[PDB]
Design a protein around this ligand. Structure first.
Ligand SMILES: CC(=O)N[C@@H]1[C@@H](O[C@@H]2O[C@H](CO)[C@H](O)[C@H](O)[C@H]2O)[C@@H](O)[C@@H](CO)O[C@@H]1O
Length: 152
């Protein structure tokens, strides 16, 4: 199983930083959206559903540093409160075609709300396949804004 970020080189496990551009001004009660489906893609390394990969997001994925913030996480058509207090539903990947991860993060903050370059969220993703032991792998996506976000 492989992933990549903005068409970079392939990733088998571990922590990767994911840089997003955000709206530089937000208002109280307004909701900030981070669409990760534009950035991260994954695929089956053999194709044909021969050794199918099963991926989900993991309990304990949270805001970093922004722990008082409210949020939601959209994953594979379902909305979960964020931070994740349970694992998400499983996405099956069997083709050698990069599939955008169907993942969005909704943030309600509660001056500068997000600093450029600071980790905003740490999202734990788990993979296991079908044959042998399934060769389980853990990925952490460190979500980071290219610009500060301010609220009047
Ligand atoms: C047996 C092995 O290590 N194979 C490598 C591939 O990994 C596997 O891929 C399948 C389908 O994605 C499944 O996830 C297995 O659990 C996993 O072992 C893959 O890493 C490729 C990359 O070119 O190299 C070997 O084929």
């Amino acid at each position: 199983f492989s992933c990549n970020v903005d068409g970079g080189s392939s990733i088998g496990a571990g922590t990767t930083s994911v840089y997003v551009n955000l709206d530089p001004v937000i208002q109280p009660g307004q909701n900030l959206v981070v669409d990760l489906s534009q950035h991260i893609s994954c695929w089956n390394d053999y194709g044909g559903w021969y050794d199918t990969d099963h991926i989900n997001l993991v309990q304990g994925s949270a805001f970093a540093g922004l722990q008082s913030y409210k949020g939601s996480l959209y994953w594979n058509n379902v909305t979960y409160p964020f931070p994740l207090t349970t694992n998400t539903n499983v996405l099956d990947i069997g083709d050698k075609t990069p599939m955008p991860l169907p993942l969005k993060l909704y943030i309600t903050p509660v001056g500068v709300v997000i600093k450029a370059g600071e980790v905003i969220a740490r999202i734990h993703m788990y993979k296991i396949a079908t044959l042998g032991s399934g060769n389980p792998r853990n990925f952490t996506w460190n979500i980071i804004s290219n610009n500060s976000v301010v609220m009047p």
